[PDB]
Amino acid sequence: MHYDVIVIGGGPSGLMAAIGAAEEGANVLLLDKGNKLGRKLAISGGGRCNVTNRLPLDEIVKHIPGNGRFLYSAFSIFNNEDIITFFENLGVKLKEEDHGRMFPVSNKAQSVVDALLTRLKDLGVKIRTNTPVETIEYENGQTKAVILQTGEVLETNHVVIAVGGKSVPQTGSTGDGYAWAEKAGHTITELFPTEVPILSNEPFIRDRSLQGLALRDINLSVLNAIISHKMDMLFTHFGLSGPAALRCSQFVVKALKKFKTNTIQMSIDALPEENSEQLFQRMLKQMKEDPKKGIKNVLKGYVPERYFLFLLEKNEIDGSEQAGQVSHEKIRALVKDFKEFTVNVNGTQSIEKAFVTGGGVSVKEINPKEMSSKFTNGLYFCGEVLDIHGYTGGYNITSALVTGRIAGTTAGENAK
Numbered sequence: 001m002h003y004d005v006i007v008i009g010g011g012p013s014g015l016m017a018a019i020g021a022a023e024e025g026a027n028v029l030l031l032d033k034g035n036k037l038g039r040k041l042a043i044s045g046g047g048r049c050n051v052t053n054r055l056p057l058d059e060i061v062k063h064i065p066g067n068g069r070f071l072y073s074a075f076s077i078f079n080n081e082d083i084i085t086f087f088e089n090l091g092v093k094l095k096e097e098d099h100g101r102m103f104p105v106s107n108k109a110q111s112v113v114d115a116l117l118t119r120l121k122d123l124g125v126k127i128r129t130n131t132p133v134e135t136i137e138y139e140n141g142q143t144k145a146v147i148l149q150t151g152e153v154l155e156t157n158h159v160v161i162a163v164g165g166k167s168v169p170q171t172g173s174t175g176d177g178y179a180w181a182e183k184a185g186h187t188i189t190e191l192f193p194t195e196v197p198i199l200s201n202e203p204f205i206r207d208r209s210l211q212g213l214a215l216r217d218i219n220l221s222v223l224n225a226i227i228s229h230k231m232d233m234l235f236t237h238f239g240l241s242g243p244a245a246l247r248c249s250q251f252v253v254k255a256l257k258k259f260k261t262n263t264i265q266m267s268i269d270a271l272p273e274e275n276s277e278q279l280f281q282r283m284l285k286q287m288k289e290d291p292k293k294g295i296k297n298v299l300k301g302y303v304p305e306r307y308f309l310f311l312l313e314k315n316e317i318d319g320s321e322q323a324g325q326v327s328h329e330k331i332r333a334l335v336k337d338f339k340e341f342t343v344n345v346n347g348t349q350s351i352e353k354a355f356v357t358g359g360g361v362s363v364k365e366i367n368p369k370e371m372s373s374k375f376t377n378g379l380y381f382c383g384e385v386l387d388i389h390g391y392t393g394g395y396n397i398t399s400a401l402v403t404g405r406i407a408g409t410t411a412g413e414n415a416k
Ligand SMILES: Cc1cc2nc3c(=O)[nH]c(=O)nc-3n(C[C@H](O)[C@H](O)[C@H](O)COP(=O)(O)OP(=O)(O)OC[C@H]3O[C@@H](n4cnc5c(N)ncnc54)[C@H](O)[C@@H]3O)c2cc1C
Pocket: 008, 009, 010, 011, 012, 013, 014, 031, 032, 033, 034, 037, 038, 039, 040, 041, 043, 044, 045, 046, 049, 050, 051, 131, 132, 133, 134, 162, 163, 164, 165, 167, 168, 171, 172, 173, 174, 176, 177, 354, 355, 356, 382, 383, 384, 385, 393, 394, 395, 396, 397, 398, 400
């Protein structure tokens, strides 16, 4: 046993785990499949890396819908503000942008990766690139060895699994970690994509009626209800995309899986600022100002023209009908479609194409203060391989950095 701790995976969690263990005085090996460490980290935040989020604790947890509450213990030890200080000290100043989102002053993800690599070098962590792991050996409820794809055996009593999820496999995250966890006794929460476009075969989608149409600042709901507020949506050839749709997508997936229906209902509130009474009266007070003018001109500007004209048809209103020859029941209907237009949807894009993989190693089986397995001694987990996931805004890297630091410092401590 040359190595006190072996960390498998050099994403943000693995890099923090290796630093965490080496600070505890352990001789640490960090293994990665790729020719470079931090490939996904290097593309994160549009190439700038949204490293963390400075919002208060309770808001951070709320933005991590996949087991955010599990992180309460971790955050007591090492939290968002601690992340900011940590990076400052490694010479990579951060800045705050919108909605609490923190980015390097350099505006370059590579800056973050390089700082972490420099700290590993300073601490004497051994790094082996192009070194894929095949499996982990366990005996007597304890970790015994890491087995490389080549067959090379690396004996150790402390292994940190930091290999990420299943999305964007070109970066190295191909779901290798789940089988190792199962071998160790763990359950895997069923995997689902997050932040992906939603599919629909509604006739109006198939006939491209609204294709390319952006609806700005809408409320998009998944009915049963889960609601994304004041975000933009886009109608595509295949369904719904844009921030509002992407946010709802994990909820579409779960629902379809739980229930075994072919479609589920979504609802679009195109004008969330205004209630159906205010909107109805707005519309009357305009139909009276110009009762001889065509309704398609009297009521322009409420929603984009293509959506407007589609909804008129749907409600059997001739756009050229005189504003004072349109029945008030048919206007009430138009207002209901402005506030709650239903769209049946029937799936989403795949996990390969997702932002983050939802599901993973169950956190019920992990000691929250340690990131240690409850089943196998000398086994630790961190990052996206765990069943933790965040919305966009820095939350996923927050969790990876935090869990990686706790897992690493616990391993390094245990190994001594
Ligand atoms: C396009 C994109 C942009 C993103 N932007 C942000 C953002 O701005 N902010 C944010 O908070 N989140 C962002 N995310 C998500 C965030 O990048 C991830 O959640 C995070 O990188 C997960 O960190 P990790 O350490 O768990 O795993 P990863 O970063 O996925 O790293 C895992 C490492 O494990 C290695 N590995 C895998 N299998 C093996 C094996 N068998 N043997 C050896 N090594 C192996 C891989 O080569 C890889 O280097 C983004 C995601 C995507 C895809």
